[PDB]
Design an enzyme around this catalytic site. Structure first.
Site, PDB file in Angstrom:
ATOM      1  N   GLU A  19      22.342  40.328  68.511  1.00 43.27           N
ATOM      2  CA  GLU A  19      20.885  40.531  69.004  1.00 43.27           C
ATOM      3  C   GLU A  19      20.276  40.164  70.268  1.00 43.27           C
ATOM      4  OE1 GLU A  19      22.080  38.687  66.514  1.00 43.27           O
ATOM      5  OE2 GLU A  19      20.646  36.874  66.467  1.00 43.27           O
ATOM      6  N   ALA A  38      27.723  43.159  65.570  1.00 40.24           N
ATOM      7  CA  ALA A  38      26.836  43.670  66.819  1.00 40.24           C
ATOM      8  C   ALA A  38      26.163  42.116  67.073  1.00 40.24           C
ATOM      9  CB  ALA A  38      25.695  44.512  66.311  1.00 40.24           C
ATOM     10  N   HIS A  62      19.399  45.960  61.638  1.00 41.60           N
ATOM     11  CA  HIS A  62      19.415  44.406  61.632  1.00 41.60           C
ATOM     12  C   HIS A  62      19.285  43.694  62.928  1.00 41.60           C
ATOM     13  CE1 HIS A  62      21.512  40.892  59.749  1.00 41.60           C
ATOM     14  NE2 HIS A  62      22.009  40.776  61.133  1.00 41.60           N
ATOM     15  N   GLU A  63      19.816  44.434  63.936  1.00 45.81           N
ATOM     16  CA  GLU A  63      19.584  43.936  65.340  1.00 45.81           C
ATOM     17  C   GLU A  63      18.291  43.976  65.789  1.00 45.81           C
ATOM     18  OE1 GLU A  63      22.074  41.950  66.289  1.00 45.81           O
ATOM     19  OE2 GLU A  63      23.330  43.114  64.656  1.00 45.81           O
ATOM     20  N   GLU A  83      19.815  34.650  59.159  1.00 46.40           N
ATOM     21  CA  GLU A  83      20.716  35.631  58.895  1.00 46.40           C
ATOM     22  C   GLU A  83      20.491  36.186  57.397  1.00 46.40           C
ATOM     23  OE1 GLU A  83      22.106  37.184  60.915  1.00 46.40           O
ATOM     24  OE2 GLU A  83      22.402  35.785  62.708  1.00 46.40           O
ATOM     25  N   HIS A 135      16.092  41.289  63.966  1.00 48.89           N
ATOM     26  CA  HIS A 135      16.269  39.806  64.851  1.00 48.89           C
ATOM     27  C   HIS A 135      15.375  39.478  65.790  1.00 48.89           C
ATOM     28  CE1 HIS A 135      19.731  37.607  63.090  1.00 48.89           C
ATOM     29  NE2 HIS A 135      20.494  38.438  63.059  1.00 48.89           N
ATOM     30  N   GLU A 183      26.628  33.761  71.336  1.00 46.22           N
ATOM     31  CA  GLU A 183      26.322  33.396  69.712  1.00 46.22           C
ATOM     32  C   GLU A 183      27.813  33.095  69.265  1.00 46.22           C
ATOM     33  OE1 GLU A 183      23.939  35.341  66.753  1.00 46.22           O
ATOM     34  OE2 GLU A 183      24.217  33.638  65.649  1.00 46.22           O
TER      35      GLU A 183
HETATM   36  N1  BEY Z   1      24.146  37.358  65.481  1.00 48.18           N
HETATM   37  C1  BEY Z   1      24.934  37.559  64.525  1.00 48.18           C
HETATM   38  C2  BEY Z   1      26.609  37.104  64.452  1.00 48.18           C
HETATM   39  C3  BEY Z   1      26.867  36.992  66.147  1.00 48.18           C
HETATM   40  C4  BEY Z   1      28.093  36.211  66.246  1.00 48.18           C
HETATM   41  C5  BEY Z   1      29.383  36.648  66.929  1.00 48.18           C
HETATM   42  C6  BEY Z   1      30.334  36.043  67.069  1.00 48.18           C
HETATM   43  C7  BEY Z   1      30.616  34.826  66.424  1.00 48.18           C
HETATM   44  C8  BEY Z   1      29.432  34.285  65.938  1.00 48.18           C
HETATM   45  C9  BEY Z   1      28.362  34.811  65.924  1.00 48.18           C
HETATM   46  P1  BEY Z   1      24.591  39.432  63.728  1.00 48.18           P
HETATM   47  O1  BEY Z   1      24.007  40.166  64.365  1.00 48.18           O
HETATM   48  O2  BEY Z   1      24.060  38.807  62.326  1.00 48.18           O
HETATM   49  C10 BEY Z   1      26.384  40.034  63.413  1.00 48.18           C
HETATM   50  C11 BEY Z   1      26.378  40.919  62.181  1.00 48.18           C
HETATM   51  C12 BEY Z   1      26.180  42.505  62.533  1.00 48.18           C
HETATM   52  C13 BEY Z   1      25.956  43.096  61.176  1.00 48.18           C
HETATM   53  C14 BEY Z   1      24.636  43.375  60.716  1.00 48.18           C
HETATM   54  C15 BEY Z   1      24.297  43.999  59.581  1.00 48.18           C
HETATM   55  C16 BEY Z   1      25.493  44.600  58.713  1.00 48.18           C
HETATM   56  C17 BEY Z   1      26.608  44.571  59.283  1.00 48.18           C
HETATM   57  C18 BEY Z   1      27.087  43.712  60.231  1.00 48.18           C
HETATM   58  C19 BEY Z   1      27.683  40.728  61.485  1.00 48.18           C
HETATM   59  O3  BEY Z   1      28.687  41.563  61.915  1.00 48.18           O
HETATM   60  O4  BEY Z   1      27.738  39.849  60.525  1.00 48.18           O
HETATM   61 ZN    ZN Z   2      22.185  38.694  62.058  1.00 45.95          ZN
END
Ligand code: BEY
Ligand code: ZN
Ligand code: MG
Ligand code: MG
Ligand code: MG
Ligand code: MG
Length: 889
Positions: free
Chosen positions: A268, A266, A301-302, A324, A305, A124
């Site tokens: 998902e 993180a 969160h993960e 998101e 998803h 992603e």
């Molecule tokens: N699938 C998402 C972002 C993945 C991504 C990585 C690199 C470039 C583009 C996209 P996420 O699980 O919402 C990631 C969340 C993780 C998170 C969730 C809840 C609280 C804090 C951090 C974040 O760090 O914003």
């Molecule tokens: Zn997310």
């Protein structure tokens, strides 16, 4: 530099039905073989076949096992593989390729890369095209059959999505594993992991269908003992989705993997969630308290998803908030239920109104559904996430729990096997809204403006009480400032959760009421109101808005003491602080501007100080809530209320207000700090890995907040307490002892002591770095140089870089040094980081977001640094787009 527009969405002229991957990991290179079983879609108009493919070394490409010739039949430009139309088949066909990639030197942490001794992917949003050729967009759903091979000794654990259907030995010390994942998925949810991984595991039996799910949590051998809390959080996450949403996990196994090098929190990936180690690993000996809430939220969160993202996916990247915003909202409900503390809600609001409100009033302002992007990685923003979450939370406020659950269920059932847009979710909520309102003419068409309109609404109030009539009126106005996205702003559907407090006894005068403001202004009238009430407005922070309550400080003090709603109490306090800050700031500024030899400052309201004392001495009040009330609003919240903010003047303003309060309350602060010791620092369950007490952690937060206030105040003999605090088994305590010693000659003594305590745990060391970086030291610039030379060196680990530099940027006095040296420091780091990791360089720009809200000189200094960065010959697309947008070019 291609600009992608929301309005331009079109389905592809091609279909990818099946992906068959062979990933062969060697010492100096990774070989990727891929067969795509493809078709021509109904939307096809005879165009060339174009694959995304970034930085791929082509060995060979074929169509139906016939090798294609470069130049004649295809072109590749290191970004796009174009196969000319006349060479593309008109029915079902196989496209095959073999490419070389190099995970070892992949420092951008996107695609396939090496994190310490772990090979790991991040796809992603646009990382899959860095692994192999593909039509790399979320609406291209396919089945995946993936084989990973590697050296057995170096990489004994091999993971990908789906069932592990084969394992085999390979000559020369190698081994392989095949993974088949029949359900359709988008390519950003593909993942692979190879390493010497150790694990904890459990079995979870689902609530309704009684399915056995295997849960595995993985890390590096050294840190396997830190995985236990994560495992508990996973179980909790599964239970909550079952209990609140009636949603069960559908697969036979879920893997969580911690890696040391990760761009965000993180990812998902379906059945194979990958985590920044700082968001999965914790122990009571080697983690700050914050890690416990952080892991709960990130694992939660993960997990959420899986439905909102994985089972119901995105039609296109402009729909990012659909997964998101909604997943953050699901994580928020979960954490509130798990923590059972008001500070969970308060902390999210605290973040939104500081960080997100700043973004929404900056040149970077966008709606939660943007109209365009160059680099999609630039749109994983506090606006899309945290304002998205508030837009998602407003549905629940409007509908109530029962009808919300009904609408959410409609959304899942209607869209479960497919892609979805923001309109699909609104549609489902509207079905619930029609049912709630008891008429099918009711709609949520106006609600869609929350998706399309940027900027923060301002909501203001005027009141009337007629004592003879027992009639109370609340006149409400809404206004969003014009910006670059909309010349004309429209009224939004604003839910306003309200109570009415009887000022004579502190009691509720009405039942729970949510006012539906749908016009620019409205008047809400209440009969049989026996006495003039104090209105309790936007309870729970019921809409993502600037609240202009127009209450006196007397009325706000009464709400702070007596209101039932934690947010309104926290906001009343916030509002009292803001009035004082703005007054004293203007007083300091006039004195500076007019070069006065003497002048007056308006004291802090004495009854407010008395209310703080009352609240702190209340045994029933929440310790976390208490730590907020003794803390002034965030600098980034304040800046939204001051033009041409002089940072030195604001610093003097905060200093005066804190001194005013401490001069009255320091004995109370010291008394509480000492009386809280027993329960806050209780060691009864220190060696119980699964026992996590959020109330106790908030008690430590309060103690450490108070210690900070007492050390700044130079309270008599407070260095004795600081030194004793450094001997605590809890990192939240001994790292606090480091920061608070900044004001004493024993700072470098505690620097050396706490470094020695931190150095042998990667994550703890990064917490030590943050604590040093945020230290209120006059020699902070010399210290950052010491950090660079002695600890950071040339680390490319995002956790290390962010830890050294970002906390420093919150040092109001020193980061904003009038010479511009702080701005030059961060720009140098941004430019240096951009050469290997554009995403993190973009993250390191955060301090510049408020550039045009500062005083004239600092505005020019920041802009100079941003123009200097933009002039860099090798600037990434990510950084260039971000800085061009931010500087209004
Ligand atoms: N699938 C998402 C972002 C993945 C991504 C990585 C690199 C470039 C583009 C996209 P996420 O699980 O919402 C990631 C969340 C993780 C998170 C969730 C809840 C609280 C804090 C951090 C974040 O760090 O914003
Ligand atoms: Zn997310
Ligand atoms: Mg390459
Ligand atoms: Mg249960
Ligand atoms: Mg939170
Ligand atoms: Mg390291």
């Amino acid at each position: 530099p291609k600009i992608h527009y929301r309005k331009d969405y079109k389905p592809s002229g091609f279909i990818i039905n099946q992906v068959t991957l062979n990933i062969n990991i060697h010492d100096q290179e990774t070989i990727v073989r891929s067969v795509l079983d493809m078709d021509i879609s109904k939307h096809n108009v005879g165009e060339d076949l174009v694959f995304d493919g970034v930085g791929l070394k082509i060995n060979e490409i074929s169509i139906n096992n016939k090798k294609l010739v470069e130049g004649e039949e295809y072109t590749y430009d290191n970004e796009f593989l174009t196969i000319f139309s006349k060479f593309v088949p008109k029915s079902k066909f196989a496209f095959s390729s073999e490419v070389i990639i190099h995970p070892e030197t992949n420092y951008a942490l996107t695609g396939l890369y090496k994190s310490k001794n772990i090979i790991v992917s991040q796809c992603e949003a646009t990382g899959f095209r860095r692994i192999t050729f593909f039509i790399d967009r979320p609406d291209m759903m396919a089945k995946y059959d993936v084989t990973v091979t590697a050296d057995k000794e170096k990489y004994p654990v091999l993971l990908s999505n789906g069932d592990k259907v084969n394992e085999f030995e390979i000559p020369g010390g190698r081994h392989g594993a095949r993974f088949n994942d029949p359900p359709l998925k988008p390519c950003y949810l593909f993942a692979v992991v190879a390493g010497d991984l150790k694990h904890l595991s459990a079995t979870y039996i689902t609530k309704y269908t009684k399915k056995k799910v295997e849960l595995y949590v993985f890390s590096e051998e050294k840190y396997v003992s830190k995985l236990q809390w994560a495992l508990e959080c996973l179980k909790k996450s599964m239970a909550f989705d079952e209990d609140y949403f009636g949603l069960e996990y559908d697969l036979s196994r879920l893997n969580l993997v911690a890696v040391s090098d990760f761009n965000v929190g993180a990812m998902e990936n379906k059945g194979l969630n990958i985590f920044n180690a700082n968001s999965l690993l914790a122990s009571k000996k080697n983690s700050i308290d914050f890690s416990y809430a952080r892991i709960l939220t990130v694992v939660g969160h993960e997990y959420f998803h899986q439905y909102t993202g994985n089972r119901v996916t995105l039609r296109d990247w402009f729909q990012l908030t659909l997964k998101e915003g909604l997943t953050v909202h699901r994580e928020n409900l979960f954490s509130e239920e798990m923590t059972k503390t008001v500070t969970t809600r308060l902390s999210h609001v605290d973040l939104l109104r500081s960080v997100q409100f700043l973004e929404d009033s900056s040149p970077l302002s966008h709606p939660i559904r943007p109209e365009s992007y160059v680099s999609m990685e630039n749109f994983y923003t506090t606006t899309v996430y945290d304002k998205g979450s508030e837009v998602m939370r407003m549905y629940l406020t409007i509908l109530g729990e029962e009808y919300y659950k009904k609408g959410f269920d409609i959304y899942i059932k209607k869209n479960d096997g497919n892609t979805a847009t923001c309109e699909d979710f609104n549609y489902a909520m509207e079905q619930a809204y029609k049912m709630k309102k008891a008429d099918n003419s009711a709609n949520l068409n106006q609600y869609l403006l929350w998706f399309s309109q940027s900027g923060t609404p301002h909501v203001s109030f005027k009141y009337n009480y007629d004592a003879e009539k027992k009639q109370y009126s609340i006149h409400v106005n809404q206004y969003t400032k014009p910006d670059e996205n909309q010349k004309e702003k429209k009224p939004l559907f604003i839910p306003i959760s309200v109570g009415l407090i009887n000022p004579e006894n502190g009691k509720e005068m009405i039942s729970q009421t949510t006012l539906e403001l749908t016009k620019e202004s409205d008047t809400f009238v209440f009969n049989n109101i026996a006495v003039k009430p104090i209105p309790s407005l936007f309870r729970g922070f019921s809409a993502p808005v600037y609240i202009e309550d127009q209450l006196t400080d007397e009325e706000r003090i009464l709400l702070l003491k007596y209101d039932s709603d934690a947010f309104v109490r926290y906001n009343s306090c916030t509002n009292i602080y803001m009035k004082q800050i703005l007054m004293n700031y203007n007083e300091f500024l006039k004195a500076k501007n007019e070069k006065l030899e003497s002048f007056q400052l308006t004291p802090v309201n004495a009854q407010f100080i008395d209310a703080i004392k009352y609240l702190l001495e209340d045994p029933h009040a929440d310790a976390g809530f208490k730590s907020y009330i003794v803390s002034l609003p965030q600098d980034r919240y304040i800046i939204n209320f001051v033009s041409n903010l002089d940072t030195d003047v604001l610093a003097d303003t905060k200093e005066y207000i804190y001194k005013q309060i401490g001069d009255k309350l320091n004995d109370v602060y010291y008394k509480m700090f000492k009386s809280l010791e027993a329960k806050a620092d209780d060691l009864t369950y220190f060696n119980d890995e699964s026992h996590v007490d959020f109330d106790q952690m908030n008690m430590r937060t309060l103690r450490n907040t108070l210690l900070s206030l007492l050390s700044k105040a130079q309270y008599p003999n407070i260095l004795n307490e600081i030194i004793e605090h450094s001997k605590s088994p809890y990192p939240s305590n001994w790292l606090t002892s480091l920061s608070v010693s900044a004001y004493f000659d024993k700072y470098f003594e505690l620097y050396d002591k706490t470094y020695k305590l931190s150095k042998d745990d990667e994550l703890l060391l990064q917490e030590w770095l943050k604590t040093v970086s945020r230290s209120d030291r006059k020699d902070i610039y010399e210290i950052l140089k010491k950090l660079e030379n002695e600890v950071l060196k040339d680390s490319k680990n995002p956790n290390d870089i962010r830890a050294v530099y970002l906390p420093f940027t919150n040092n109001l006095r020193r980061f904003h040094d009038i010479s511009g040296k702080g701005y030059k420091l961060i720009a140098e780091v941004i430019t240096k980081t951009d050469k290997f990791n554009p995403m993190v360089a973009t993250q390191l720009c955060e301090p510049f977001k408020l550039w045009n809200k500062l005083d004239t000189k600092r505005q020019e200094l920041m802009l100079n640094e941003m123009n200097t960065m933009l002039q860099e010959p090798q600037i990434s697309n990510n950084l260039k787009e971000y800085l061009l947008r931010l500087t209004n070019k």
